[PDB]
Every structure is written in C-alpha cells, then in structure tokens.
Design a protein around this ligand. Sequence first.
Ligand code: SOJ
Ligand code: CL
Ligand code: CL
Ligand code: CL
Ligand code: CL
Ligand code: MG
Length: 348
Amino acid sequence: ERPTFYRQELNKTIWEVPERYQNLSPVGSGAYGSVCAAFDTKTGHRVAVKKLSRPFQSIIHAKRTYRELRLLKHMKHENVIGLLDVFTPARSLEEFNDVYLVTHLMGADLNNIVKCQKLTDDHVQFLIYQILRGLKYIHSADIIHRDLKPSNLAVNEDCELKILDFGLAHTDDEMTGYVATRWYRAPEIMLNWMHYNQTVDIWSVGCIMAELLTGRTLFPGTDHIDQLKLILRLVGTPGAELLKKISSESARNYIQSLAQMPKMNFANVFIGANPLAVDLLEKMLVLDSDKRITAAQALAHAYFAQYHDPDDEPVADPYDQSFESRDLLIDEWKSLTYDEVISFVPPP
Ligand SMILES: Nc1ccc(Nc2ccccc2)cc1
Ligand SMILES: [Cl-]
Ligand SMILES: [Cl-]
Ligand SMILES: [Cl-]
Ligand SMILES: [Cl-]
Ligand SMILES: [Mg+2]
C-alpha cells in the first residue's frame, strides 16, 4: 500500500514526500541534488532526504542514478552509510521522474575533529581501525571507494565512524590547484597513469592517518606536479623493480627526467608517534601499489591489538556489477531504476 504524500516548496524547490517525514529544513545542494534534514516518525531517527537533480537527463546521468541506488541498497555494515528508504511520488513507470534517497543524518566529519580536538594515540587507533573494518567489507564486494578523505568520514560524540560519499565517477577543474579533493589520491591515478584498483583506497587511509597524528595535511600540493614531487620526496623515486612494471609511456618519460631520491626515515618525519603507527604507515604509503598492505592484513597489525576481533570483522554478500559494461537507452536505465525503487525492503 502506497503512503500518502504531501507537497511543499523549500528554497524554490518542490518536495513531495510521505507523511512520515516531518519538519523538513534545507541543509545544502550540490550538483547532484538538494538535501533537507527531517524527522522520521516511523523510526524516530533524524534523517537526511536527498532529491536527485535531473536524474535521467542523459544516458550518462541515468546510468549514474542506477549506479548510486544499486550501491546504497547493497551496503549493510556498521562502518558504512546505509539506505533507510528510497521513494518516488510517481504511481507508474510512465509518470516516473523524481527519485528521493533517505539516510541517517550525519553531524561532524573527521575534518572537524582534526582541526578542533586533541587526539590521543588511542583515538587514532580506534578511528583508523573503523575505517579499515569498513574497507575490508567494501573491498570484499569488489567495490573501490575512490574518494576517501576526511570530509567523507562521519564521526559522532562516541568516536564512532561511518564511510560516506562513494565515488560515482569529479571533473578536471575540481581537481586543479591547491585543493583537498586531490590531496588524498594515490600517485598512479593522479594523472591516470594506471587503471583504478582497490589499493588506491589504502593510499588514502595512509594520508588520513598521517594527518590525525600530526594535525597537518601530508601532501598539500599546489597542483598535480607539485604534489607528485612532495610524494616522491617522502617515499622515494621508482626503483628498478617498479620501473619494469610501469605500462604508461607518459609516466615513464616524465619520471625519467627527475633526479633520483631515496625513501626518507619515517621516524624522523612523524616525531613522537607510536613506533607501531610508524610501521603501519610505512606499509600503506608504498609507491608500488602491488606491495601495499591490504585492509584485511592491516586489521591484524599489532597497532590495533586492543580492538581487533577476527570474529567481528564481517565481509559482504557478492555484488553483481555486470551492468557497468552494458549499453542501454535512457528509458532502459530508467526502468531498471524504477524496479529497484519499488523492490526496496527497509532494514529492521
Ligand atoms: N603502469 C604504472 C605502474 C605504476 C605507476 N606508478 C607511478 C609511476 C610514476 C610515479 C609514481 C607512481 C604508474 C603506472
Ligand atoms: Cl507516511
Ligand atoms: Cl516522479
Ligand atoms: Cl576533506
Ligand atoms: Cl548483486
Ligand atoms: Mg563528500
């Protein structure tokens, strides 16, 4: 049975939502939609309600809408954002135009915490442990997050953490200059010299952990090339083993122009840090992505001895991504999205 919907205009936008959602108040609007905070009378939760902007305006946009809904419906883990509800006011596929997504309302992010709070080593242990616990789950479904950074990590008053804002495939201008959008990205993808794989997310975790330990951005480059130079000064220029593996002619020709540099001593960079934290950073921030520690391996590192429990670090159900190689028309992506809206089953 379909709920009753009511309409209201908020900051020049029409919102048509089920009666269960009350006290709507605008909180932001990006290029993908607008967001209101609300009170959900069915669950008692404060929620974020996002109305997608132009979800089916082109093939690229229609596929992106389907991609986002499929991802959010799959994620069921304590350290990853999940979907509380999805709805449309349409009564049939023929009148289907608008999609609304509902999640738990998040307060502070990790940006707020590192700028404002004095963190003990125990705080860093617990925060990084939770990132890695969620990432083990994500990676076990063969998903790559692609955009891990402090503003995409929600944290509450009890220091409990959730991963947000999966990369749905950011423009070139958004990555240009002195911008946090690029400071956490792995070197092999910053100029697209290699195809994305899950090891890029571990590089991001290393950059985040360093910033929690020092209070400062690790690689705050003023552009792509300045940032690469900061990276290679810390971790060294590519050695013979890694050079043999480089398959990008653009990478090779530029890298060969730089004077060679050795890896620095991390104990002299991260002065005063727990030696076990330094050891883990050395295993994450490895230039050769084949040699980086994985999320599952990192959970067993001695730095996390007080939190690690191998019986409480779950993996995901399998996730079918075959749609990503499929070529369909706008109305076919739209019909697939409609089916996923109507089949949604809420959590307990
Ligand atoms: N194919 C391939 C392999 C490794 C890399 N990584 C890299 C290259 C130059 C500088 C820093 C990192 C790129 C392409
Ligand atoms: Cl309702
Ligand atoms: Cl609609
Ligand atoms: Cl950020
Ligand atoms: Cl699936
Ligand atoms: Mg974000």
